[PDB]
């Protein structure tokens, strides 16, 4: 189970890397090409592998794999919510950033007009992508990442008006307001997570015994 | 020696942290305040400690400590070359970025109009500030840092014209050209490193024996 699941997950990660390379080249991709990457044995597991990889693309990277030919199984890529930014730099092997941008936008939209930076830090600190490197000499990578988002005008960062000592908050920047909307971001979050839960357990009913 | 130098360097790092806090608050600082941070014993070593800390500020962080009152020993701060950017974010404990920005600008100015990104990566990879975290899932921190500099318009990043497959290069952005100049950056580099060296050894003279 644990070994077999490790090997299966390795195949998933290989397909994710292959699809990311296709995305960088702005090349379409077929099921047949993907089976030309799922080497040997694991052909039988293509439905699950594919289904995981696609999911990863949406959730981690903010990239949507879209079937344009159901018969030939031809796929193209789009950035989630149509954003004009994916955080890439030429052909350098760095991670697309649109998923994390959308997560931050969603936290802000959940809170209202703005969100204290502490809420952003708390929410981002639970994501495994930061792999315990908060203590980097250069600076906490999640905060430098939000700096990326502020410099691209998707976010605005400002002092909370009238705070002493100074406190700071994030709002949607002009580019975020032009390219998307509160309803589209919140809908995307509800869609790609599945309907949420955390329902309270039966501590709301009385046994009347 | 090694222990004593470790303790002395720890005092240097404490003074660097204190001066960085003063810089964030845009507060002036006196020698007397600094001795109120060099706790106890190490008062006698204030000349060397100070001299190291100040040097660090220039070389690592791109911050110049400037004496405005020789009698009272009052100091203020400036960003090196007068840049309007230091890479900070509110009161978050992240490292000022102006020194690394100036290093990149200097590599470009050394090469001419532009520099291939590979030269930038090679030169940045020798700096200990990146502490062997090139393999971060989020992306290589030195490349994300250059992304900071491109998004602030200090750098421009573009494909090398006519390259196949695509190669990429860095040039000075409009903000860098407005705020400083090639001569000022190259002079700053010559100044803060001391006059360079790496002179060839006596493999250029003939012993004529």
Swiss-Prot record, chains A, B:
Single annotated GO MF: caspase binding
Positions of disulphide bridges: none
UniProt keyword annotation of Ubl conjugation present: yes
Alphabetical UniProt keywords: Tumor antigen, Ubl conjugation, Ubl conjugation pathway
Start and end residues of each MAGE domain: 8-207
Any GO CC annotation of this UniProt entry: endoplasmic reticulum
Modification after translation (UniProt): Ubiquitinated by the DCX(DCAF12) complex specifically recognizes the diglutamate (Glu-Glu) at the C-terminus, leading to its degradation.
GO biological process: negative regulation of autophagy; negative regulation of endoplasmic reticulum stress-induced intrinsic apoptotic signaling pathway; negative regulation of protein processing; negative regulation of transcription by RNA polymerase II
Tissue: Expressed in many tumors of several types, such as melanoma, head and neck squamous cell carcinoma, lung carcinoma and breast carcinoma, but not in normal tissues except for testes and placenta. Never expressed in kidney tumors, Leukemias and lymphomas.
The keyword Ubl conjugation belongs to this UniProt entry's keyword annotation: yes
Function statement: Activator of ubiquitin ligase activity of RING-type zinc finger-containing E3 ubiquitin-protein ligases that acts as a repressor of autophagy. May enhance ubiquitin ligase activity of TRIM28 and stimulate p53/TP53 ubiquitination by TRIM28. Proposed to act through recruitment and/or stabilization of the Ubl-conjugating enzyme (E2) at the E3:substrate complex. May play a role in embryonal development and tumor transformation or aspects of tumor progression. In vitro promotes cell viability in melanoma cell lines. Antigen recognized on a melanoma by autologous cytolytic T-lymphocytes.
Subunit structure: Interacts with TRIM28.
Designated name of the protein: Melanoma-associated antigen 3
Organism annotation: Homo sapiens
């Amino acid at each position: 189970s644990m070994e077999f699941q490790a090997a299966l997950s390795r195949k998933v990660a290989e397909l994710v890397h292959f699809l990311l390379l296709k995305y960088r080249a702005r090349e379409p991709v077929t099921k047949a090409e993907m089976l030309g990457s799922v080497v040997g044995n694991w052909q039988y597991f293509f439905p699950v592998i594919f289904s995981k990889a696609s999911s990863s693309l949406q959730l981690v990277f903010g990239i949507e794999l879209m079937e344009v030919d159901p018969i030939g199984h031809l796929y193209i890529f789009a950035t989630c919510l149509g954003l004009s930014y994916d955080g890439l730099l030429g052909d350098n092997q760095i991670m697309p950033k649109a998923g994390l941008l959308i997560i931050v936008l969603a936290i802000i939209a959940r809170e209202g007009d703005c969100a204290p930076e502490e809420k952003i830090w708390e929410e981002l600190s639970v994501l495994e992508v930061f792999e315990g490197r908060e203590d980097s000499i250069l600076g906490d990578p999640k905060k430098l990442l939000t700096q990326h988002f502020v410099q691209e005008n998707y976010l605005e960062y400002r002092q909370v008006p009238g705070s002493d000592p100074a406190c700071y908050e994030f709002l949607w920047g002009p580019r975020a307001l032009v390219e998307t909307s509160y309803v589209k971001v919140l809908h995307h979050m509800v869609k790609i997570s599945g309907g949420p839960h955390i329902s309270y357990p039966p501590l709301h009913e009385w046994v009347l015994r």
